[PDB]
Design a protein around this ligand. Sequence first.
Ligand SMILES: *Cc1c(COP(=O)(O)O)cnc(C)c1O
Ligand SMILES: *Cc1c(COP(=O)(O)O)cnc(C)c1O
Lengths: 398, 398
Amino acid sequence: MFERIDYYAGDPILGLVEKFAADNNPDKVNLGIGIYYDESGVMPVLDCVKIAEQRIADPISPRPYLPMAGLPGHRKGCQELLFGKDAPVLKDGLVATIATIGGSGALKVGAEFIHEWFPQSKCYVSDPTWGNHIAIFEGCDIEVGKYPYYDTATGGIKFDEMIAFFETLNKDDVLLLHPCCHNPTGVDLTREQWDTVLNVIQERELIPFMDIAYQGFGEDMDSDAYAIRKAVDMGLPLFVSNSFSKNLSLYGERVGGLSVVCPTVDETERVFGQLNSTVRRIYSSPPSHGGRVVDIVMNDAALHEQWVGEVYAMRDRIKSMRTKLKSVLEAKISGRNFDYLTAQNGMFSFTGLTPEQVERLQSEFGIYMISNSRMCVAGLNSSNIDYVANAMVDVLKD
Amino acid sequence: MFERIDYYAGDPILGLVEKFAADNNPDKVNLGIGIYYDESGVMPVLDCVKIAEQRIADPISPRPYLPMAGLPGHRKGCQELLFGKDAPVLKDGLVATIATIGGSGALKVGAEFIHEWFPQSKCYVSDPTWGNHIAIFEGCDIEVGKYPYYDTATGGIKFDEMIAFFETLNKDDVLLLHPCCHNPTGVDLTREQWDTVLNVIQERELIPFMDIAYQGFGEDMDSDAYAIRKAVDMGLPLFVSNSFSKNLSLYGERVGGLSVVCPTVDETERVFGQLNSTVRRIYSSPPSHGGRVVDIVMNDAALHEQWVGEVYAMRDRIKSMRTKLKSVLEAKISGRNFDYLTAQNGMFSFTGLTPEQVERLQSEFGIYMISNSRMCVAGLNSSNIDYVANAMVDVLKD
Ligand SMILES: *Cc1c(COP(=O)(O)O)cnc(C)c1O
Ligand SMILES: *Cc1c(COP(=O)(O)O)cnc(C)c1O
């Protein structure tokens, strides 16, 4: 019956989860999946979340379906975080927002909406990008290409080539953009580069689709949203998918949002209705427990302030690991360049190791990076940094 | 930008949720959405769920992603419920099962898999069916038709016409079948009718896709699964979507499963891998809180026995309302026929009221049924049964 069905090779990120767990090497280190671990290598339960979950458990309450769009406080939490508290765009009623099944589910609903209402639009992703961007959009029968982004020669952005590429595109083509904390490279546009990009997007009448999953891990909540807020101010038809998986340490509860910025209230109503219709035919409505955690944390000013501080602590630990690893590598290999470790932003660094070097880190040392050279900086701590640096020196020796 | 985007009219079931809440009529009755309410008209928290949620809250634990397939105990819980504890098919390793975002998400993953691997297959749904069946499959760019089912003249199944229809179909065409508790009609196939249907399905090499959302509300857990277990015994390529929304009173946490029965272990591996790939590009992985509730309740023999008893109590209350309403209607309109109320099974009855009569129940009495005449029997209780019967008599008077 099913002999026609290909084996699934497994995902380049998620295929490593079982492998790492199974590995017998006592000095193994997980630098693969983009999860925040603390200084002891443990995933935190945030205090703001622990307080919200105690509230949800007291009393244990009936569990009706949420609205197709999710809880109104979850939607508002996403909007204020992305656009700013009491932003003009929100006061004007010009943003259609739904709660989603993580950032992945937001990308899927956005792609389904684009496939239905803009069937002739093609989507372009950065070279390189998180591979699931391509999987989600191709899975909606949308044609997906790449725009030039990471320059392997400079460790910077091929900015002029990227702009020249955008100038070739058609009205209503979609660009999947990373407003901050680029995945996988950690190489981000400057503010001046954003202003330039968004001007080309406006001129060419392209649709910017910003996917934000590590807000607060770059500079700060407001700075990380610069490109979003700039696009709004320019009047662009912006889609924004956001995830709380990493910044609420709530990966498993599947919490995110999708927002579409519209020119008029009537267009907001049309788009919001169609987002609801799209949700209904994918999963009906989103999960109550994660929605309540988001609602409670984002809308209590005390828990929200506590949460921001917890995110900035995670941000600061990652920054400490970047500096520590760079200083160790610079000492172990005299004169060779590791500036990328402190220049890159967010959860990831792009090490430039070849696929063979990444394979050798795995097989010889039990150190797990993604085959594209991406390393999760949060997997580093005082206990493993020397081991990792020594292994990297060994594999770089070629 | 978005003037091209149609207003969404809202769903025929879910469009009534806000309307009912807003309604000022003090005697309003919700017989729309298929939710179980107790004798006081309140949605229960099941005791088995309350115990599982106390466990999840003690201690509040880190929240890593679940596997793409969900928790192994959630998958096993679905399998044992559908196929039977230690069923030969499970011992043989011939069922590929994932946890899903409710029954809706299982239907969506199954439809996405069918669209990808069987792109030339058409799907057929019963006339009538739950409207979201059509929305989910059409939303995957699968062609959807209907097979003859409910006979308005007899209140029975057009069995011969349905069989004659199946005999016209192509190898690998998909039939969306309700193994029990038909939605919206409550009119179910007999065991002898199932054996006949499944023989035609085998002969024509059709793919049966059974969608089960009210297991335990028909006769009992095992009897309600007859058609599933018969299809397995016959060696059919069965897909089964199941929901725990209604039978665990856990609508908002989004818990269900999708299972595909395969002829060999290698085909099970191919199909299971592709179900994982399909999940990854829709929502990545399912929600932790609902998955843990399913895992804890289904795999603790004490909580599982408690749960079965709670479902059978809901089953029995619905059966008491069917008999009470039938006796009241038979007295209020002498000689006219209400046998359908006790002949139909599960959450629903198909009243045969016209769309205009349904509109009048809503506007004059604040009694909410779906426009296709479907009434949710669990919305009835001692406090509203006379009111409802009187209103039905008034609207039937034409
Ligand atoms: C993690 C991530 C997502 C989605 O993650 P979820 O767990 O589904 O929230 C989306 N985009 C990017 C760039 C990510 O890094
Ligand atoms: C309720 C229902 C579903 C799915 O419901 P979820 O809340 O998504 O579990 C699927 N099919 C049928 C026939 C139903 O009645």
